[PDB]
Amino acid sequence: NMSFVKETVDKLLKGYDIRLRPDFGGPPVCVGMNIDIASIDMVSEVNMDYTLTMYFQQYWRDKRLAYSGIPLNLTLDNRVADQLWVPDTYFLNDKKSFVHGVTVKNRMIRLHPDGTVLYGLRITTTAACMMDLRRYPLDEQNCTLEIESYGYTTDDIEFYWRGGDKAVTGVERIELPQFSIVEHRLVSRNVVFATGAYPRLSLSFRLKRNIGYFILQTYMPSILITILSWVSFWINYDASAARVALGITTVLTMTTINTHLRETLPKIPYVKAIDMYLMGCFVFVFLALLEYAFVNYIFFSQPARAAAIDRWSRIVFPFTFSLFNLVYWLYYV
Amino acid sequence: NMSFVKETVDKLLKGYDIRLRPDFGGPPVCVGMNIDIASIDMVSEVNMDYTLTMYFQQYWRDKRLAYSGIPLNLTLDNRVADQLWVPDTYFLNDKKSFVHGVTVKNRMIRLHPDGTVLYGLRITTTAACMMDLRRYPLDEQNCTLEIESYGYTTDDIEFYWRGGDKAVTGVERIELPQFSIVEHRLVSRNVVFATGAYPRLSLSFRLKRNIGYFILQTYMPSILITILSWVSFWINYDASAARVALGITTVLTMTTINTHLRETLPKIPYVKAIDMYLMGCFVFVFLALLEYAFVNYIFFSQPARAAAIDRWSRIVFPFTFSLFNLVYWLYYV
Amino acid sequence: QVQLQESGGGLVQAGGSLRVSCAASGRTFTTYIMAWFRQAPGKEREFLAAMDQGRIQYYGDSVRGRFTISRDYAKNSVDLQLDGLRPEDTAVYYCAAGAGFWGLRTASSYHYWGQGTQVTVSS
Amino acid sequence: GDVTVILNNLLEGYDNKLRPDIGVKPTLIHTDMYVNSIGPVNAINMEYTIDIFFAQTWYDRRLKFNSTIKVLRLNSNMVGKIWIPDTFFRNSKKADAHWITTPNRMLRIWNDGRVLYTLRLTIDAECQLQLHNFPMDEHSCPLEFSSYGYPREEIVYQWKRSSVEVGDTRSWRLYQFSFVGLRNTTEVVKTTSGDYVVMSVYFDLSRRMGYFTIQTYIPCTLIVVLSWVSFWINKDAVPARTSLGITTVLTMTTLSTIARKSLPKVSYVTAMDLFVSVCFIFVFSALVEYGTLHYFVSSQPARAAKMDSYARIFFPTAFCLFNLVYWVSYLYLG
Amino acid sequence: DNTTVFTRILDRLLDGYDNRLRPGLGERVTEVKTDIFVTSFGPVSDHDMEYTIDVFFRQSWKDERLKFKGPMTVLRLNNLMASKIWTPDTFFHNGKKSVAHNMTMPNKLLRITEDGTLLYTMRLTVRAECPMHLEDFPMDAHACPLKFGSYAYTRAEVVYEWTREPARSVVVAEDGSRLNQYDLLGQTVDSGIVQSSTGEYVVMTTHFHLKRKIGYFVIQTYLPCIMTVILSQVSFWLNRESVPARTVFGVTTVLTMTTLSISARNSLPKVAYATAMDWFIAVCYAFVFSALIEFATVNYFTKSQPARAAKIDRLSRIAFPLLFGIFNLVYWATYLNR
Amino acid sequence: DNTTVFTRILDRLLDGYDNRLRPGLGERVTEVKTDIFVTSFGPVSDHDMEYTIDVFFRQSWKDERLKFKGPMTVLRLNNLMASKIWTPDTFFHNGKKSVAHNMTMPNKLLRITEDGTLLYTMRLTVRAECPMHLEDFPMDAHACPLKFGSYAYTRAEVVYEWTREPARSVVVAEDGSRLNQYDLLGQTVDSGIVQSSTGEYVVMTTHFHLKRKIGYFVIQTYLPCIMTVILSQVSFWLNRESVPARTVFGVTTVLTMTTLSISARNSLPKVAYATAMDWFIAVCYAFVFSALIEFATVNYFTKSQPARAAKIDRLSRIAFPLLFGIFNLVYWATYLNR
Ligand SMILES: *[C@@H]1O[C@H](CO)[C@@H](O[C@@H]2O[C@H](CO)[C@@H](O[C@@H]3O[C@H](CO[C@H]4O[C@H](CO[C@H]5O[C@H](CO)[C@@H](O)[C@H](O)[C@@H]5O[C@H]5O[C@H](CO)[C@@H](O)[C@H](O)[C@@H]5O)[C@@H](O)[C@H](O[C@H]5O[C@H](CO)[C@@H](O)[C@H](O)[C@@H]5O)[C@@H]4O)[C@@H](O)[C@H](O[C@H]4O[C@H](CO)[C@@H](O)[C@H](O)[C@@H]4O[C@@H]4O[C@H](CO)[C@@H](O)[C@H](O)[C@@H]4O[C@@H]4O[C@H](CO)[C@@H](O)[C@H](O)[C@@H]4O)[C@@H]3O)[C@H](O)[C@H]2NC(C)=O)[C@H](O)[C@H]1NC(C)=O
Ligand SMILES: *[C@@H]1O[C@H](CO)[C@@H](O[C@@H]2O[C@H](CO)[C@@H](O[C@@H]3O[C@H](CO[C@H]4O[C@H](CO)[C@@H](O)[C@H](O[C@H]5O[C@H](CO)[C@@H](O)[C@H](O)[C@@H]5O)[C@@H]4O)[C@@H](O)[C@H](O[C@H]4O[C@H](CO)[C@@H](O)[C@H](O)[C@@H]4O)[C@@H]3O)[C@H](O)[C@H]2NC(C)=O)[C@H](O)[C@H]1NC(C)=O
Ligand SMILES: *[C@@H]1O[C@H](CO)[C@@H](O[C@@H]2O[C@H](CO)[C@@H](O)[C@H](O)[C@H]2NC(C)=O)[C@H](O)[C@H]1NC(C)=O
Ligand SMILES: *[C@@H]1O[C@H](CO)[C@@H](O[C@@H]2O[C@H](CO)[C@@H](O)[C@H](O)[C@H]2NC(C)=O)[C@H](O)[C@H]1NC(C)=O
């Protein structure tokens, strides 16, 4: 029974030409695609890309591979893939990708009596997507993956999603440390290049960034330094060393925060929301030290007006800082 | 002349079975090994590995390759290595290695009239060794390299060092920027795994870390800050702001030193000698500030007792600190 | 708060399908292992089935081929299809979620537990 | 046409496992090198990058032919079919050939049997750097190559008339160093498997100081002057002079950290570490000077009055003298 | 002639042999027995939620097509020959990027017995995914899995089993542990079934149970924060008239707490929730903040109600150490007992 | 029916075919038509003096040895036959390590027409050197080249030409810009000859013009420095008895300028010459330094010649804003125009 299978397979591969597509010169060959996403990780702002691991399946019919007499689907050793014709599928926005090869190359070939071929691969790819970070970190992103045929046109090959909107599975099981997947979408269209038309499939995800990390790591230190800058208003004006030391140490701490965030955050040369918030806090502590500049400048000629300025500053600064926070969060959430 | 050599080589390689070891089914084949070390670099504490470049040579006898009539040692093109049996040698603790290939694959095959084969390879490998840093930066490390046969037992292959203690050369020409090689050693033993006994050769080095960098870069600032914390004992006790500012600023400076060292040295999460020294200095300046807190607490009712405590602190603190330094620089040096 | 509410159960006539569900609330268990346990009257607490994040299915050696586990990750739930029920299957079925530390087949490794659901088989 | 017949007859009866004149005389190889660019020098890892065109010429009696065609110009498709010397670079840490869009190899054969083989290489070569005089250090970085398997009795290398050529030396990626010149030599090295001919090329490099001057020397000088600013501030401004002193100490430490980030972790003192440490000593002594002045105001007010006047002269004088000795020693005496 | 006899048997075994078909195709299920030897359990990365492991992978199956008769009963095979016969296509489900070592030669071994049994061993380094719950950081424990199975053959064609009892089928070397921040407690071995869009497959699973070492965070973060809080409460024992002294004291202990908090937070990975250290640091920060508010209140009430200010300082000298000790008791009893 | 005829053609074309010889060997000069489609102009690295580009590389040439007759006037083949024919050995002269993509198949296409004209297309990621003169940083403009030609064939054997008019032979996608900090102004297309020791070669050149974006340096460096200079001259309007206010103004502006200078110079590429930002920061630093020297002078002459000290303060109140405004006008007029 095994010798008959060996004979049938060697019959199929005898005279088989790898350089010719199925139905060469006639109607285009239709290829169906399935993607089973296993994990998404390393969404890099600096590199402007993301890493995706998936199972990529392709289904197509080749009449030259039809066999009879065996009521079974033949899963063959993946090295037989080098003896057959497979589509020249590629990813348009892929920067670096590879096929896993432990313990062997993660590839699958399966045959059916009618001639249908199933071709599976386990692929890890780094795909590039542009990120608009003007609203960072309160931003939404839309990252895609483009699937196209390198050499054939719509007169030779056609792409469709096998199963409709159910062709891609596994998104609901993905957990991202900093993002949360909101939606995914499947688009089929053709791209008219200079060499002719090209079938293309597109898979897109929309990501919404999480805020808890930035709240506990970025915004709270600046808020606390701003609140600490109000301690000066409750200190006696003759304590020059204490108020000067408080003012200049809060200035140095805010400067150190802004400079080191600029050193660690990705170099994005346009105004983001975090730079506006940090600059606003720096302005608030600048005005808090400038208020004492006025008081020190006028506490001898008009000590009562300087005391009234300190008393009103004890109310205006927390109130104006809460008004700034209210406007910032309304304008960004 | 040349045609005779070509005839002899084609006769040698005709009917040669590469799947069979020399003396297959009989006495084990003896393999002698030499290593010539070119350089050692990038001894990484973070990754716990080191990089080695070497000329690895193996020496065995295969009677299937004996030839007569040519009084020469035939050095062949290295691609003939793909047509000959070579040992399945591997390095147990290797993480990543490769053979150089410019301008061609750095490989050598040399034949001798009696059938002896010399097989050379230029290899750069990254080997992992466990490091005990509890005496850091006064530590001494022992990093090895394991050599074993992957699929042969002592019934089929044996290892020995060709040349006795001269088998490894080039150790004295290794210049590590942060270590000096005190000694190296050669061992030969059989590892008893589940599948059987496996021959093994081991080469180990002992590295001693240099201390001059850490004396200037780490210990001196801590020592000088600790001495500066003693300045307050010679200041009038009615200057509370000066002695409080000095004490708390020395505490802040010691914290700054500790966090800077936290950022600069590799993350090795267990208690080392540097942590014990920094903790001892933090304790000394903590007790000096607690002493001033006690003096300021008692200086009104008992001025004489407070001045006597300060006078005795001017003796006890330098003496206790010198005893602490003596214990430290004796338990490790 | 986090609550594991269980549905289904009841009584069956020594056979037929019986799909017991389990809905979670207050925390998303996508990255956790969700399992099912069984407690016969006064007897030991027994592991039945479990499914991790990768959809790997584990079963006890007594219920293999009879009980089928599944998870609805979108709705953050888990179901157990009981087929070929027997009188010995009358017990209280529990729903659990955990990280499986020191063993996913041990009951002492699950942080959250359900309130139970009686399944009675009549012959 | 007939070129295919020539190639087929040349490759007929050819054994590429044997070098030309294997049992008669050593094979003489003439080597040439054109340097496209010398990439950045990595002092931390003590290595440098170089991109070259490497050419080799030798005689093979087995490749003679007669025709009206003088030379057969071929691509890399025949490189694997004839004998090629197994030249390698002895001090190379990582080297590779270029394969875009095709293997960058050219092969030319003349009717007398002469073979020219050329390929493009990018090499990361080892260069041990002595950084005692950093950033006023000079180095001669080598590039050595030989044969891996053939001893001196089988393969001999030799430089041609124009050995190493360089084009636009100004179109390179050397920021820290300036290229001086090159030399090429020949030596015989004895190993455990025989004696081999080794060919070496040395590139002389002198470091530029403008970067370390702008980043380190000038800021440190200005910080020292700023610590001298405290001597002209009224002694009653205790908070102002204390904040100035401690902030200059913090700035000195901040600049001190970035001094060694461009160097490997050598355990000897460099000229930069000495300069930064002396600046640190100057600001340390200026702050101890203020601590002494503050303490003496109550005890010996006249002495504290004279202390700042003396410091206004001694500190700039001692720092100018130190800079004079430092730069004289490191620029005119070594 | 013994070598020629052996060569003939080698050149005869593979006559009519197709390596594109598994043994027993269309007749029975190919049983694969598997065991793992761990030579080094490499570093665990909490940032990337992944770990490295170096293993010897041993597989065993039966192929009737490879029976032979000869003087020996066991054959060791060169790695060139091991690629001519059918071998299982085992892969790791949660692997990220694995390496099969071939220095200086492929680290594969294939032994054939006379009855037709094949033993296939290889050396691999596997980087796998270990998702972690960090709510209890740095007092957390994790179970890092390792799952493997057949990529192409369904459970109707190929099944996997452990060579011995599952506990004794995965063996770790004595010096295997190469972990600087974790303590390997043990492993549990299991086996399940998965279903995909292509069929149902058998999965073999192993879980390694890790517990994080806390001494580094105790000596690096917790102790400096506790000492800073104690220092801030020392200010209560300074005399009231030293207003600049106590103000510099309080504001510098506040700056010390801020510096320690930022240093500690630098080590932590970017997680959404709050760890146990986030709560410890927030409480210490609130304690030093309240100590400076307390001194601001005393200074506000000084020179007008000295009796109340003295009573506040006397009660604060008791309440602050008491409240901090109670907080430490609750903190180190809620998390150390999990 | 048709496939048999197509395969017999494919098995007939390469009868007595030598891919080691170029078309028209010894009869004419092979002409290659070249065009590029830039899918994405990748990042530009100032530190490494290089850039990345992802392109479709299209080459057309005529080979009379591959004429065929059949109903299909055009035949498109994947990759096995295209490696059995002669293709130009094009390489990039200034190109560094480049990548030819291999997922999921070799990204190569070969088309043949009835007359024997061949079209060869490939997808590449070219990483090339772009020497830069950063004297005008961050107000600089650069022209990064991309030069390619034949490695082994001199201009007497192979010559390159653009498929269309040179402007229209290089095409950039509208979405193919990946420049965080640069604007792609345009490109220039050229052809020429290079001379070596092995002969003369044809080289095709393309230059991409880039302009750096300055708003980042304006908001991060220039504005804080201008504000710090303004504060330093604000100090001149406070009464001379207010020693703490003017001293804190002076020393805080000095500390701010020092911090800004350190931050600013830790982001530039390591160039050993001075740029425009180095000069701007140096002048702002010298202005706040002279402002603190001016206060040191006022405090020195106070209590002895208050009239001279007041006259010095008044003249600094006039000279400093005017001099700083003139310095800014000269700086910006000099650099923005060039
Ligand atoms: C441990 O395991 C690892 C693997 O895990 C193993 O490493 C691999 O080792 C094998 C050898 O065992 C290597 O394979 C060889 O690679 C040679 C070139 O290497 C360069 O290119 C590699 C990529 O190859 C692609 O590109 C080249 C052209 O540049 C092309 O020839 C290949 O087919 C291939 O092209 C495919 O993919 C591209 C896309 O990438 C497609 O566009 C294309 O359509 C096609 O699908 C690359 O990986 C290499 O980089 C590695 O290595 C370098 C050091 O070398 C290192 O610096 C890097 O970091 C990296 O590690 C490198 O850039 C190739 O020339 C060899 O092919 C020879 O030989 C074979 C075997 O005999 C033969 O079948 C071939 O036909 C060919 O014969 C020659 O080739 C000559 C080339 O000039 C040619 O002139 C001759 O004419 C002849 O070619 C033919 O000859 C016939 C007969 O005469 C004639 O009819 C024809 O017309 C034609 O002329 C061989 O493939 C593999 O590259 C290594 N991979 C890696 C990652 O290292 C390691 O060795 C193992 N160690 C041990 C100890 O066991
Ligand atoms: C991230 O960002 C990307 C990019 O913006 C988003 O991708 C876009 O998604 C939308 C929504 O799915 C896409 O629009 C759809 O496009 C398809 C394809 O149309 C093409 O192919 C058709 C054949 O299959 C063909 O008929 C079309 O030709 C028509 O349209 C062109 C438009 O120029 C016109 O010139 C022709 O004359 C024709 O009129 C075309 O070639 C299309 O089928 C969809 O139609 C739906 O919507 C229309 C109304 O708009 C409705 O009438 C239909 O019945 C149907 O319901 C729809 O237009 C868009 O193409 C995607 N963009 C790209 C570049 O691919 C992605 O969604 C974002 N992510 C997330 C998560 O949102
Ligand atoms: C071939 O190699 C052998 C082995 O290296 C050479 O024999 C050695 O020659 C050296 C030099 O004369 C002696 O010191 C050794 O004692 C010899 N070895 C033995 C085992 O006798 C031999 O000379 C080489 N032949 C040629 C022609 O180079
Ligand atoms: C590189 O080597 C070549 C070959 O030895 C040198 O060329 C000869 O050098 C000697 C002096 O060593 C002269 O006497 C010859 O006239 C040179 N021959 C020539 C130039 O054809 C060459 O000088 C070396 N390059 C150096 C040293 O920079």
Least Cα distance to E191 among B259, C61, B224 occurs for C61
Could you tell which of A50, A204, A206, A208 is best to mutate to test the pocket of ligand 2, judged by most ligand atoms within 8 Å of the CB? A204
CB within 8 A of E326, min separation 6: which ones?
none
Q: Does F205 touch chain A (CB under 8 A)?
A: no
Least Cα distance to A33 among A184, A172, A199, A205 occurs for A199
The finding on whether B73 has its CB within 6 A of some atom of ligand 3 is yes
Contact A172 C73 (CB under 8 A): yes
Tokens standing for E84? 């001519």
Q: Quickly tell me which residue has 């010691």 as its tokens.
A: B254
Least Cα distance to F187 among F208, F173, F204, F167 occurs for F208
CB within 8 A of F333, min separation 6: which ones?
none
Cα–Cα separations (whole angstroms), residue C25 to A236, C6, C29, C72, C114: 54, 11, 9, 13, 11
In chain D, which residues fall in CATH 1.20.58.390? 210-333
Per-residue DSSP letter, F282: H
Residue C10: what residue type? G
Beta-strand pair F117-129/E99-100: unpaired
Is the peptide bond prior to E138 cis by the omega test (within 30 degrees of 0)?
yes
A218-230 burial code (b ≥16 CB/10 A, e <16)? bbebbebbbebbb
| Cα–Cα–Cα angle for B201, B203, B208, rounded to 5 degrees | 160
H/E stretch holding D286? helix D271-299
Q: How far is E103 from chain B (nearest CA, A)?
A: 6
How far apart, in whole angstroms, are the C-alpha atoms of residue F167 and residue F161? 13
How far apart, in whole angstroms, are the C-alpha atoms of residue B314 and residue B295? 14
How far apart, in whole angstroms, are the C-alpha atoms of residue E77 and residue E79? 6
**CB atoms closer than 10 angstroms to residue A240:** 21
Q: Quickly tell me which residue has 């400093």 as its tokens.
A: F320
Tokens standing for B21? 């070891």
Binding site listing of E for 4-aminobutanoate: 58, 121
Atom 2 of ligand 3: nearest residue by CA position: B73
Contact A297 F181 (CB under 8 A): no
Contact status, residue F13 vs residue F69, Cβ threshold 8 Å: no
How far apart, in whole angstroms, are the C-alpha atoms of residue B276 and residue B258? 12
Binding site listing of F: 58, 121, 237
How far apart, in whole angstroms, are the C-alpha atoms of residue B160 and residue B164? 9
Taking the centre of ligand 4 as the mean of its atom positions, its distance from the CA of residue D207, in whole angstroms, is 28
**CB atoms closer than 10 angstroms to residue E210:** 24
List strand residue ranges (DSSP E) for chain E, in order. Answer: 30-45, 50-62, 74-77, 90-92, 99-100, 108-113, 117-129, 141-150, 158-162, 170-172, 182-195, 200-212
How far apart, in whole angstroms, are the C-alpha atoms of residue C96 and residue B41? 53
Q: Could you say which ligand is closest to the alpha carbon of residue A181? A: 2
B149 backbone dihedrals φ, ψ, rounded to 5°: -95, 135
Of how many residues is chain D composed? 334
Residue by residue, DSSP assigns A125-174 as EEEE-----TTTTS-EEEEEEEEEESS--TTTEEEEETTGGGSEE-GGG-
Residue B247: what residue type? G
F214 backbone dihedrals φ, ψ, rounded to 5°: -110, -10
| Cα–Cα–Cα angle for B177, B179, B180, rounded to 5 degrees | 115
Tokens standing for A52? 């995706």
B207-231 burial code (b ≥16 CB/10 A, e <16)? bebbeebbeebbbebbeebbebbbe
End-to-end CA distance of chain E: 70
List strand residue ranges (DSSP E) for chain C, in order. Answer: 3-6, 10-12, 18-25, 33-39, 45-51, 57-59, 67-72, 77-82, 91-98, 112-113, 117-121
CATH top class, domain D210-333: mainly alpha
Per-residue DSSP letter, F136: G
Contact status, residue B119 vs residue D193, Cβ threshold 8 Å: no
CB within 8 A of D169, min separation 6: which ones?
D179
Taking the centre of ligand 1 as the mean of its atom positions, its distance from the CA of residue D99, in whole angstroms, is 10
Residue B222, annotated as binding a ligand? no
- Partner chains of D (3+ C-beta pairs under 8 Å): A, B, F
The finding on whether D166 has its CB within 6 A of some atom of ligand 4 is no
How far apart, in whole angstroms, are the C-alpha atoms of residue E93 and residue E147? 6
Looking at ligand 2, which atom is closest to the CA of residue A143? 1
Tokens standing for E118? 């094949």
Three-class DSSP category at D220: helix
Least Cα distance to F64 among F26, F118, F20, F19 occurs for F118
Select the residue of A75, A169, A217 nearest E153 (Cβ to Cβ).
A75
Report CA C73 to chain centroid distance, whole Å.
16
| Cα–Cα–Cα angle for F169, F171, F177, rounded to 5 degrees | 155
Region label for E49, one of left (φ > 0), alpha (ψ between -120 and 50) or beta (otherwise):
left
Q: How far is C119 from chain E (nearest CA, A)?
A: 26
Nearest CA in chain A to C30: A173
Q: Where are the alpha helices (DSSP H) in A233-272?
A: 240-264
HEC secondary structure over C74-106: CCCEEEEEECCCCHHHCEEEEEEEECCCCCCCC
Give which of C27, C32, C53 to mutate to test A binding, by max A Cβ within 10 Å.
C53
Q: Quickly tell me which residue has 């020996």 as its tokens.
A: E72
For this entry, resolution in Å reads 3.6
CB within 8 A of F71, min separation 6: which ones?
A25, F2
Cα–Cα separations (whole angstroms), residue F299 to A240, B241, F295: 19, 26, 6
How far apart, in whole angstroms, are the C-alpha atoms of residue B208 and residue B182? 7
Contact E195 C57 (CB under 8 A): yes
Sorted by where each starts, the structural domains of chain A and their CATH numbers stand as 2-209 (2.70.170.10), 212-332 (1.20.58.390)
H/E stretch holding D223? helix D218-229
Q: How far is E2 from chain A (nearest CA, A)?
A: 32
Tokens standing for B267? 């993350």
Contact D243 A240 (CB under 8 A): no
Contact status, residue A39 vs residue E129, Cβ threshold 8 Å: yes
Least Cα distance to F251 among D162, A252, D155 occurs for A252
For E35, how many CA atoms within 13 A lie in the half-sphere containing its CB? 15
How far apart, in whole angstroms, are the C-alpha atoms of residue B299 and residue B95? 66
Beta-strand pair B168-169/B29-44: parallel
How far apart, in whole angstroms, are the C-alpha atoms of residue D330 and residue D133? 7
A and E touch with 3+ CB pairs <8 Å, answer: yes
Least Cα distance to F77 among F88, F66, F93 occurs for F66
Looking at ligand 1, which atom is closest to the CA of residue E100? 5
Contact status, residue E73 vs residue E116, Cβ threshold 8 Å: no
How far apart, in whole angstroms, are the C-alpha atoms of residue F288 and residue D237? 20
Beta-strand pair A196-209/B116-128: unpaired
How far apart, in whole angstroms, are the C-alpha atoms of residue C121 and residue C88? 8
How far apart, in whole angstroms, are the C-alpha atoms of residue A133 and residue A332? 13
Taking the centre of ligand 3 as the mean of its atom positions, its distance from the CA of residue B77, in whole angstroms, is 21
Per-residue DSSP letter, D26: P
Long-range contacts made by residues E275-281, C-beta under 8 angstroms, separation at least 24? E275/E134, E275/E135, E275/E136, E275/E137, E275/E138, E276/E135, E276/E136, E276/E137, E276/E138, E276/E139, E276/E331, E276/E335, E277/E137, E277/E138, E277/E217, E277/E221, E278/A216, E279/E331, E280/E222, E280/E225, E280/E331, E281/E221, E281/E225
Per-residue DSSP letter, E10: H
- The approach used to solve this structure was cryo-EM
Tokens standing for E38? 């761990």
Residue by residue, DSSP assigns E127-170 as EEE-----TTTTS-EEEEEEEEEESS--TTTEEEEESS-GGGSE
Sorted by where each starts, the structural domains of chain E and their CATH numbers stand as 2-213 (2.70.170.10), 216-334 (1.20.58.390)
Residue by residue, DSSP assigns E52-106 as EEEEEEEEEEE-GGG---SS-SEEEE-HHHHTSS----EEETTBSS-EE--SBS-
Tokens standing for E279? 């709560």
How far apart, in whole angstroms, are the C-alpha atoms of residue F258 and residue F278? 13
HEC secondary structure over chain B: CHHHHHHHHHHHHCCCCCCCCCCCCCCCEEEEEEEEEEEEEEEECCCCEEEEEEEEEEEEECHHHCCCCCCCCEEECHHHHHHCCCCCEEECCEEEEEECCCECCCEEEEECCCCEEEEEEEEEEEEECCCCCCCCCCCEEEEEEEEEECCCCCCCEEEEECCHHHCEECHHHCCCCCEEEEEEEEEEEEEECCCCEEEEEEEEEEEEECCHHHHHHHHHHHHHHHHHCCHHHHCCCCCHHHHHHHHHHHHHHHHHHHHHHHHHCCCCCCCCHHHHHHHHHHHHHHHHHHHHHHHHHHCCCCHHHHHHHHHHHHHHHHHHHHHHHHHHHHHCC
Bridge partners (DSSP) of residue B267 are none
Tokens standing for D46? 């003590």
Taking the centre of ligand 3 as the mean of its atom positions, its distance from the CA of residue D21, in whole angstroms, is 21
Three-class DSSP category at D219: helix
Cα–Cα separations (whole angstroms), residue E139 to B190, B269, C33, F26, F195: 42, 14, 21, 79, 69
Residue A173: what residue type? R
The finding on whether D200 has its CB within 6 A of some atom of ligand 4 is no
| Cα–Cα–Cα angle for B292, B294, B295, rounded to 5 degrees | 60
How far apart, in whole angstroms, are the C-alpha atoms of residue A55 and residue A34? 8
CB within 8 A of A45, min separation 6: which ones?
A131, A133, A266, A268
**CB atoms closer than 10 angstroms to residue F266:** 13
HEC secondary structure over D229-273: HHHHCCCCCHHHHHHHHHHHHHHHHHHHHCCCCCCCCCCCCCHHH
Bridge partners (DSSP) of residue E141 are E211
End-to-end CA distance of chain B: 69
F29 backbone dihedrals φ, ψ, rounded to 5°: -105, 125
CATH fold of the domain at D2-207: Acetylcholine Binding Protein; Chain: A, (2.70.170)
Residue B193, annotated as binding a ligand? yes
How far apart, in whole angstroms, are the C-alpha atoms of residue D46 and residue A120? 46
Q: CATH for C3-121, among 2.60.40.10, 1.10.357.10, 3.40.50.970, 3.30.300.30?
A: 2.60.40.10
Q: How far is A262 from chain E (nearest CA, A)?
A: 15
How far apart, in whole angstroms, are the C-alpha atoms of residue B226 and residue B219? 11
Region label for A15, one of left (φ > 0), alpha (ψ between -120 and 50) or beta (otherwise):
left
Contact status, residue D228 vs residue D315, Cβ threshold 8 Å: yes
List strand residue ranges (DSSP E) for chain D, in order. Answer: 27-42, 47-59, 71-74, 87-89, 92-97, 105-110, 114-126, 138-147, 155-166, 177-190, 195-207
Contact status, residue D165 vs residue D34, Cβ threshold 8 Å: yes
How far apart, in whole angstroms, are the C-alpha atoms of residue A302 and residue A300? 6
Tokens standing for F224? 């804080």
Q: Could you say which ligand is closest to the alpha carbon of residue D203? A: 4
Beta-strand pair F99-100/F74-77: unpaired
Per-residue DSSP letter, A218: I
B133 backbone dihedrals φ, ψ, rounded to 5°: -110, 25
Select the residue of D83, D121, D291 nearest B102 (Cβ to Cβ).
D121
Tell me whether residue F225 is exposed, middle or buried, using C-beta atoms within 10 angstroms of its C-beta: 0 to 12, 13 to 18, 19 or more.
Answer: buried
**CB atoms closer than 10 angstroms to residue B5:** 19
How far apart, in whole angstroms, are the C-alpha atoms of residue B318 and residue B323? 9
Is the peptide bond prior to B137 cis by the omega test (within 30 degrees of 0)?
yes
Q: List F residues 208-237 in contact with D (Cβ-Cβ < 8 A).
A: none
How far apart, in whole angstroms, are the C-alpha atoms of residue F175 and residue F184? 12
The finding on whether D163 has its CB within 6 A of some atom of ligand 4 is yes
Q: Quickly tell me which residue has 């007006």 as its tokens.
A: A305
D170 backbone dihedrals φ, ψ, rounded to 5°: -80, -15
How far apart, in whole angstroms, are the C-alpha atoms of residue D79 and residue A279? 64
